[PDB]
Structure formats: C-alpha cells, structure tokens
Design a protein around this ligand. Sequence first.
Ligand SMILES: [Ca+2]
Length: 116
Amino acid sequence: DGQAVGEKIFKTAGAVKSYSDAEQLCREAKGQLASPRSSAENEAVTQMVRAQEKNAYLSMNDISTEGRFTYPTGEILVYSNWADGEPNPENCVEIFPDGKWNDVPCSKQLLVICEF
Ligand SMILES: [Ca+2]
C-alpha cells in the first residue's frame, strides 16, 4: 500500500539507506525514488515522512551540473520546495516532515520512499 496523487503512487517499507542503496531498492522494485512534481505530490510524500518520523530522499541530484537539480531523466526541476536558506558537498535532497527540502551529502542514511 501507499499514498497516491493522480496516477502516481508513493510506497515505503521503512528502509533507511544511503542515496545509491535507496536508488537500487526502488529500481529493483520497478519504480524510482520519490520525485514530487507538484504541491499535491509533495504533500503525499510529506505525510509518509511524518508517519515514519524520518526524513526521506528525493530522486533529484545536482551531480551533473552543481546547483542544477535534475530527475533521473536528466530534466530540470518543474517544482521545488526548499527550506528557508536552502540549497545553502551536498549533491542529494532530503524532505522534512514539514515538507520542505534540504540538500544533503549522498552518503546520508534516509527513509526510502519509491514512486510507481
Ligand atoms: Ca543543505
């Protein structure tokens, strides 16, 4: 089970992993890391973070061009929800239980939320 918005479904098993391990878990499940593209999608992911009491990874990263955060397609963000002062190396993105985002080191261990 999980939270859905439109045709997108977000799911978690409560796993806590580094970015690379998180990406592999979602891909092996035939999904990808949570990639909220709208307010409504962001709120669905946020509800799951609040339930699990653990910040989660989003998919987006700036490893290709610093400051330019992209999806696994390589396309630029169509939506963002950065915390005050963010983005403030921190190439990956976490989402807080208040729904705001913070760039983080990709070695950080965070909740794994996948989208389908
Ligand atoms: Ca940061």
